[PDB]
Amino acid sequence: TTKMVSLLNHSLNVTTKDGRTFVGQLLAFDGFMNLVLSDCQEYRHEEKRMLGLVILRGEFIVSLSVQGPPPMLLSGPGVARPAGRGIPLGQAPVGLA
Amino acid sequence: RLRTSRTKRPPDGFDEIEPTLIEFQDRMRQIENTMGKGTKTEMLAPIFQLHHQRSRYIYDLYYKREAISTELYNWLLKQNYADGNLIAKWKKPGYEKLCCLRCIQTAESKFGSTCICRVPKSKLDKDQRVRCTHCGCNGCASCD
Amino acid sequence: LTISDEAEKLKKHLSSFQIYLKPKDYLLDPKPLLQLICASFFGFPVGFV
Amino acid sequence: SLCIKLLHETQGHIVTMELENGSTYRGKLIEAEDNMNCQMRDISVTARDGRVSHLDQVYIRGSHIRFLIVPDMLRNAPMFKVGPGRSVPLPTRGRR
Amino acid sequence: VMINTTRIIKHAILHDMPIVLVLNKVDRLILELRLPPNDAYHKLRHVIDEVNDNICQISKDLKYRVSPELGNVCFASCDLGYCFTLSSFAKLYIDRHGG
Amino acid sequence: KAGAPDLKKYLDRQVFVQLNGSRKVYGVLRGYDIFLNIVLEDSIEEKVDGEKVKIGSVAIRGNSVIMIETLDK
Amino acid sequence: TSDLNVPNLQMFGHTAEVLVARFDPSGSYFASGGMDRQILLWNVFGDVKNYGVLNGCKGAITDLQWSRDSRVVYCSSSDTHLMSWDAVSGQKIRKHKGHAGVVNALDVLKVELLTSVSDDCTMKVWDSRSKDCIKTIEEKYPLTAVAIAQQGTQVFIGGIDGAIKIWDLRNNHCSHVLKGHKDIITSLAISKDGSSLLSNSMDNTVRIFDVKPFASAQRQLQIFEGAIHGQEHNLLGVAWSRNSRFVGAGSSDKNVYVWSATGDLRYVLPGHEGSVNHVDFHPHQDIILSCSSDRTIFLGE
Amino acid sequence: KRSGATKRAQDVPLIKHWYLEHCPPNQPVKVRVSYQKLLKSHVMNKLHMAHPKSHTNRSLLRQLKNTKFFQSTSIDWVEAGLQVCRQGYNMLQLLIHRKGLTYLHLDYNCNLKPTKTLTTKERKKSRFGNAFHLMREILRLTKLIVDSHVQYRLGNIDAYQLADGLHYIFNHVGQLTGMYRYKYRLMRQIRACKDFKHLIYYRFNTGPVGKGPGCGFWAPSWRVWLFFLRGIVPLLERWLG
Amino acid sequence: PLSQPIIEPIRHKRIAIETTNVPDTVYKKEFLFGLLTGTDDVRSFIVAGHLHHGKSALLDLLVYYTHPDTKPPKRRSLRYTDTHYLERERVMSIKSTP
Amino acid sequence: TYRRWKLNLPQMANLHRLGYQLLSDLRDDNYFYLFNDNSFFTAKALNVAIPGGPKFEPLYKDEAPEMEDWNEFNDIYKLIIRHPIKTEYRIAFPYLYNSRARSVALSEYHQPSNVFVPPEDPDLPAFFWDPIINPITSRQLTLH
RNA sequence: CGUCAAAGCACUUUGCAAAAGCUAACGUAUCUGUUUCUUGCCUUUUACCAGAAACAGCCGUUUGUAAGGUGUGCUAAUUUGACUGUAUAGUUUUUGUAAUCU
Ligand SMILES: O=P(O)(O)O[C@H]1[C@@H](OP(=O)(O)O)[C@@H](OP(=O)(O)O)[C@@H](OP(=O)(O)O)[C@@H](OP(=O)(O)O)[C@H]1OP(=O)(O)O
Ligand SMILES: Nc1nc2c(ncn2[C@@H]2O[C@H](COP(=O)(O)OP(=O)(O)OP(=O)(O)O)[C@@H](O)[C@H]2O)c(=O)[nH]1
Ligand SMILES: [Mg+2]
Ligand SMILES: [Mg+2]
Ligand SMILES: [Zn+2]
Ligand SMILES: [Zn+2]
Ligand SMILES: [Zn+2]
Structure with a gap:
């Protein structure tokens, strides 16, 4: 049931045993998957009804699906300074002399 | 370290090896008294010698002849009869015959390098096979 | 049980209530251990409310 | 459980709920249980067809509930973490 | 019950104020006084009776009567962090052991 | 586990019970169980037409109880 | 000849030799890392100051690669690991394990695919979330540098043998070798379009090869002399310009080398205090980045 | 408690509650x-309580151990005390000999006595300062303590005699060293030791136990001298430097 | 007098305990405002009794639960709702802090 | 490193038994009423001295008659003498019983009295009615 | 106790950094010094006497972090953190009062 927790705050549409559909934002679920939906709209065959905060029973629920993503360094020791390149008179690798 | 007559009795396997440890202690005392014939650091070389030898004796007791119980061996290390760090070095590959522990650490050298004794003789020239100044060591490397 | 230093018996009794403590918790001072046990056993003071 | 906690939160407000019949009830919630049995006052029942009646005191059994329309300002009710043994979602101060 | 408690009770009943009694520092009966459970119950009962007497000295109405069976008295140990009643502890039995 | 329903205030009062299938029974509540099984005495049944028959002592299974109603002010 | 405040800018930081410093694909940011087990993030334009450090790595940053999103950073460590650092928050995302030696090189794909080689004579390709090597290729001698084609089926791995191996991830047929080198290949870099490969080897010759399915024999285009490698056996980098007409390299002779892709030496500019591990060009302007084993990184034109 | 943090051995007063409470009657x-003066010292300490200031952890011993000129080992305490006494004596002798003051004799008990009658020139040249004399007297006290322990180790005295001797040493620094001359603020510590002696004595010699030698409860005086040394160490190091 | 400074030092007279910013709680402040404004869930009462019988500890019991940030002090009780340096000195409530 | 300890209950009980001569027997803290640190700070500030406690320097020497006047405020003419104002009052209530009250410090007013008496003999049960406690008989009440 | 996650773990050495924010024991302990004032004893200086203010030093403590050491392991051990964590076909949710038409 860990996956079910991942659906918190997502927007959900739930088909019911009646056949209606509630769409809204999930607030909290249950062991019997009682759902709490905020800002809920009703889909009665399509007719629109504002419901608001709605608690669905576990038995009433048939299926559910998501419709939207959930609403959503300190420092370092580095310091820069301009400088030029100094040409050496040698042509040899560092190890070899 | 020092044990009284009323102290807790050492484990069972101690008494048969007690006399030779006593001999080690006796000669350590003699080396303390013995003076002369060396520079400021050469006179202190035989100390490490005997110390390594004593620790090697205990190491030989456990790991090569299993003549002592594990309880007695932990007791011996806890009573400083052996150097735990030196034995730990002896238990890893490349340091089977380590002389002492000052010839492995690089913070005590001028140029941040180990001692000459740690170096295999095959890559060392014939002329520079000299006695270590730290402990008189004549070759630590496991190859030799 | 909390005071009298009975770790195993107290642990078993709390396990029966599904109250689970970390092993380092039984080795606490008597008074903070009492507070921890009482806060796990009797949660929010809902009786007063 | 958080859902029954919210249902308990609702008591004293006006909540609308519909049962397995299809009738919707509009009244003041006065009691609630873990089974979601509800006690109501001043109910205005709207039947499935549309007939409107009135009731004074009812004790609706929980098993015959489809959903409830909780008042909106309970959206900010706190959802507390529930341990294994705890049966009521409450603020915690012990281990968990 | 002390002198200021008596004054508070008198002024509250004189002003028609419901009173909820919290019997604090219960843990001192167990850890300090070391009373046996029965004598601890007697001590609690005596304190409640003293509060009820102080109430009755003003108005003998039954509306102002504090006693645990009315849910009007809470046993608390705020240092150890608990404050229960008869009904709260009873519920804490019921949730564990059924219906 | 289970839980006892709160019905002490409903005891020994004239009550109306709505069962499943559009039933309806009067009566005085006399007892209840964990599963809301209720017991009624000297009760009266309503039919769809509307005439009341004396139905008597009744022991309703709690599974079928839709609502329990009192009428007093 | 750019938007830089100064023609030449010295960057001071780090507590040991810096081994890699790579530009953001957008050309707005870049990071650096080395033997100090630390990653420093910088700002290309403005005051050029640090805005974050990436602590937690338990080893030297042998190589690192920016992500196309410019939001996550992948770092290769000498301690047989491959960490994924979130640039904008600085927390551990994931640590990919499975190698058996020092992870030498790293490369990223146009698709979240990572590739790497290590001294255990293996090559491993990683998904950004799999946390495990989905494909593994075993060789006989340790591998030193990788290049992944942006199209996503051919990988070029250069190692001790002095011959570049081309591996087809799907085909697993390897009977096609880009012979021509004679010593250790320090670095490989693919052209922007995906047609030419830049190779640097310890045999002192920087060579350029073509990356096409079809060839007219002797796939070797041309070689460049001068870039010499010291006795420290360092991993010297090579870079492809944004227009892929100037090829760059670093040499252990304190020289930064830029060639015109036609065999004519263009830049010989000195300026480093030690062996220069990495060199890179800006994808928008004519900036050249230097990274030497002297705790310093140079800006360019 | 049943859980704590292992305070240092000298951070445990063991008799503080004796004078924090009231004085027993009929004393x-x-x-x-003595009760009143110890309470006064405690109150003065508590009044000027300063919240400790933040500072990074630094310690002389770790810095010295980092160098190659210092080594480490484990030895008996009496051996370490003998070594410290001998080293201090050698150091004091080497400064009395790099001055040409070879006619002055520093005996093994740390007394500077001339070996011959001195002219005015020698007497003015051989005048040392408060730093040298203060350090010499501290060294003399240390040698007294280590010599008591050595006597106990030889079997010349038993444990009870050793404890009594140590208590006497710590209570009678002003009569055994003469260190007070070169730093007179030691008199506070001397007064404190006398006060502690009074408390312990009048709580020790009660009943069957009477007057005489024997009271060896030397922890309070010992920690008093430790806390004097804590403050005098930086001053002496600066003066000797 | 010599005591009067020429340049007065910057003095901020703090008398009570007061958190500069509102500490977090287990609930939301808007929720509490909704209960106070649009609900009958508000109870107004006083906590009274004798001296040192534990009435401030009763409120500390609730503060420990609603305010997770607060922690018990080292050597005494929290004594929330004291908020006066004088009361913290005498270790007893002198004012009626709501 | 020997930096933290955890002891059992029997061990702590036995240590408490062994070192029983060197620990207080108060467990109340009401014993130090006017003889604790804050009272001493107040006494030092006011220059008074409780006859069992320390004596300090005045800390405030500014009491010269610079005003040269009695201010007709503290004069006997208009003052009711009932009981002398002892210094215990001036230390207990520093801000009421004396003017010129600067640098004084306030002390804890009261503590709940401890009612724990340790058992005399272990054979008795831990929970036992002590005869010193008065019996609970209060048939002097008029309840509802 | 259980599940998930990442961290080798236990002990220990050294370096760096920090330690009141909401009135409160970094240390339930306790020394020394400087400057500016006021005192005590005083033939002058150090050395002193005892109170205050402002400053410092020393003996110590805690935490974070980095690199190592010893002993055991990676063919497993321990620690840390998080968790909406448990049964159950027999009325109150998950082993169907369903289909049938309208
Ligand atoms: O030798 P002193 O320095 O003069 O000390 C002695 C001595 O104490 P020490 O044992 O510390 O020397 C006595 O102590 P006891 O052996 O008798 O216990 C005794 O002290 P009491 O009489 O108080 O026991 C005596 O005191 P007095 O001078 O009164 O004779 C005096 O101690 P003080 O030097 O502390 O006075
Ligand atoms: N043993 C024990 N002590 C308690 C308990 N509750 C409070 N105390 C102690 O009671 C003392 C006073 O606590 P406070 O909360 O200040 O009591 P108060 O009534 O607010 O005091 P005032 O405000 O002056 O009247 C403190 O020592 C608390 O630790 C308890 O439940 N058990
Ligand atoms: Mg209060
Ligand atoms: Mg003169
Ligand atoms: Zn050697
Ligand atoms: Zn050696
Ligand atoms: Zn050597």
Whole structure:
């Protein structure tokens, strides 16, 4: 049931045993998957009804699906300074002399 | 370290090896008294010698002849009869015959390098096979 | 049980209530251990409310 | 459980709920249980067809509930973490 | 019950104020006084009776009567962090052991 | 586990019970169980037409109880 | 000849030799890392100051690669690991394990695919979330540098043998070798379009090869002399310009080398205090980045 | 408690509650005054309590151990004490000989006595300062303590005699060293040791146990001298430097 | 007098305990405002009794639960709702802090 | 490193038994009423001295008659003498019983009295009615 | 106790950094010094006497972090953190009062 927790705050549409559909934002679920939906709209065959905060029973629920993503360094020791390149008179690798 | 007559009795396997440890202690005392014939650091070389030898004796007791119980061996290390760090070095590959522990650490050298004794003789020239100044060591490397 | 230093018996009794403590918790001072046990056993003071 | 906690939160407000019949009830919630049995006052029942009646005191059994329309300002009710043994979602101060 | 408690009770009943009694520092009966459970119950009962007497000295109405069976008295140990009643502890039995 | 329903205030009062299938029974509540099984005495049944028959002592299974109603002010 | 405040800018930081410093694909940011087990993030334009450090790595940053999103950073460590650092928050995302030696090189794909080689004579390709090597290729001698084609089926791995191996991830047929080198290949870099490969080897010759399915024999285009490698056996980098007409390299002779892709030496500019591990060009302007084993990184034109 | 943090051995007073409480009745005047003076010192300490200031952890011993000129080992305490006494004596001898002051004799008990009658020139040249004399007297006290322990180790005295001797040493620094001359603020510590002696004595010699030698409860005086040394160490190091 | 400074030092007279910013709680402040404004869930009462019988500890019991940030002090009780340096000195409530 | 300890209950009980001569027997803290640190700070500030406690320097020497006047405020003419104002009052209530009250410090007013008496003999049960406690008989009440 | 996650773990050495924010024991302990004032004893200086203010030093403590050491392991051990964590076909949710038409 860990996956079910991942659906918190997502927007959900739930088909019911009646056949209606509630769409809204999930607030909290249950062991019997009682759902709490905020800002809920009703889909009665399509007719629109504002419901608001709605608690669905576990038995009433048939299926559910998501419709939207959930609403959503300190420092370092580095310091820069301009400088030029100094040409050496040698042509040899560092190890070899 | 020092044990009284009323102290807790050492484990069972101690008494048969007690006399030779006593001999080690006796000669350590003699080396303390013995003076002369060396520079400021050469006179202190035989100390490490005997110390390594004593620790090697205990190491030989456990790991090569299993003549002592594990309880007695932990007791011996806890009573400083052996150097735990030196034995730990002896238990890893490349340091089977380590002389002492000052010839492995690089913070005590001028140029941040180990001692000459740690170096295999095959890559060392014939002329520079000299006695270590730290402990008189004549070759630590496991190859030799 | 909390005071009298009975770790195993107290642990078993709390396990029966599904109250689970970390092993380092039984080795606490008597008074903070009492507070921890009482806060796990009797949660929010809902009786007063 | 958080859902029954919210249902308990609702008591004293006006909540609308519909049962397995299809009738919707509009009244003041006065009691609630873990089974979601509800006690109501001043109910205005709207039947499935549309007939409107009135009731004074009812004790609706929980098993015959489809959903409830909780008042909106309970959206900010706190959802507390529930341990294994705890049966009521409450603020915690012990281990968990 | 002390002198200021008596004054508070008198002024509250004189002003028609419901009173909820919290019997604090219960843990001192167990850890300090070391009373046996029965004598601890007697001590609690005596304190409640003293509060009820102080109430009755003003108005003998039954509306102002504090006693645990009315849910009007809470046993608390705020240092150890608990404050229960008869009904709260009873519920804490019921949730564990059924219906 | 289970839980006892709160019905002490409903005891020994004239009550109306709505069962499943559009039933309806009067009566005085006399007892209840964990599963809301209720017991009624000297009760009266309503039919769809509307005439009341004396139905008597009744022991309703709690599974079928839709609502329990009192009428007093 | 750019938007830089100064023609030449010295960057001071780090507590040991810096081994890699790579530009953001957008050309707005870049990071650096080395033997100090630390990653420093910088700002290309403005005051050029640090805005974050990436602590937690338990080893030297042998190589690192920016992500196309410019939001996550992948770092290769000498301690047989491959960490994924979130640039904008600085927390551990994931640590990919499975190698058996020092992870030498790293490369990223146009698709979240990572590739790497290590001294255990293996090559491993990683998904950004799999946390495990989905494909593994075993060789006989340790591998030193990788290049992944942006199209996503051919990988070029250069190692001790002095011959570049081309591996087809799907085909697993390897009977096609880009012979021509004679010593250790320090670095490989693919052209922007995906047609030419830049190779640097310890045999002192920087060579350029073509990356096409079809060839007219002797796939070797041309070689460049001068870039010499010291006795420290360092991993010297090579870079492809944004227009892929100037090829760059670093040499252990304190020289930064830029060639015109036609065999004519263009830049010989000195300026480093030690062996220069990495060199890179800006994808928008004519900036050249230097990274030497002297705790310093140079800006360019 | 049942859980703590292992305070240092000298951070445990063990008799603080004796004078933090009231004085027992029917005591001589000196005991009452001792109680009052110790309470005064405690109150003065508590009044000027400063919240500790933040600072990074630094320690001389770790810095010295980092160098190659210092080594480490484990030895008996009496051996370490003998070594410290001998080293201090050698150091004091080497400064009395790099001055040409070879006619002055520093005996093994740390007394500077000339070996011959001195002219005015020698007497003015051989005048040392407060730093040298203070350090010499501290060294003399240390040698007294280590010599007591050595006597106990030889079997010349038993444990009870050793404890009594140590208590006497710590209570009678002003009569055994003469260190007070070169730093007179030691008199506070001397007064404190006398006060502690009074408390312990009048709580020790009660009943069957009477007057005489034997009281060896030397922890309070010992920690008093430790806390004097804590403050005098930086001053002496600066002066000797 | 010599005591009067020429340049007065910057003095901020703090008398009570007061958190500069509102500490977090287990609930939301808007929720509490909704209960106070649009609900009958508000109870107004006083906590009274004798001296040192534990009435401030009763409120500390609730503060420990609603305010997770607060922690018990080292050597005494929290004594929330004291908020006066004088009361913290005498270790007893002198004012009626709501 | 020997930096933290955890002891059992029998061990702590036995240590408490062994070192029983060197620990207080108060467990109340009401014993130090006017003889604790804050009272001493107040006494030092006011220059008074409780006859069992320390004596300090005045800390405030500014009491010269610079005003040269009695201010007709503290004069006997208009003052009711009932009981002398002892210094215990001036230390207990520093801000009421004396003017010129600067640098004084306030102390804890009261503590709940401890009612724990340790058992005399272990054979008795831990929970036992002590005869010193008065019996609970209060048939002097008029309840509802 | 259980599940998930990442961290080798236990002990220990050294370096760096920090330690009141909401009135409160970094240390339930306790020394020394400087400057500016006021005192005590005083033939002058150090050395002193005892109170205050402002400053410092020393003996110590805690935490974070980095690199190592010893002993055991990676063919497993321990620690840390998080968790909406448990049964159950027999009325109150998950082993169907369903289909049938309208
Ligand atoms: O110096 P005081 O504190 O006054 O104590 C001295 C004396 O000390 P001196 O030897 O320094 O004079 C003894 O004390 P210790 O020498 O033993 O410390 C002795 O103590 P005991 O009798 O306990 O051995 C006794 O003190 P008291 O008489 O209080 O026991 C005596 O005191 P008087 O000076 O009063 O004779
Ligand atoms: N043993 C024990 N002590 C308690 C308990 N509750 C409070 N105390 C102690 O009671 C003392 C006073 O606590 P406070 O909360 O200040 O009591 P108060 O009534 O607010 O005091 P005032 O405000 O002056 O009247 C403190 O020592 C608390 O630790 C308890 O439940 N058990
Ligand atoms: Mg209060
Ligand atoms: Mg003169
Ligand atoms: Zn050697
Ligand atoms: Zn050696
Ligand atoms: Zn050597």
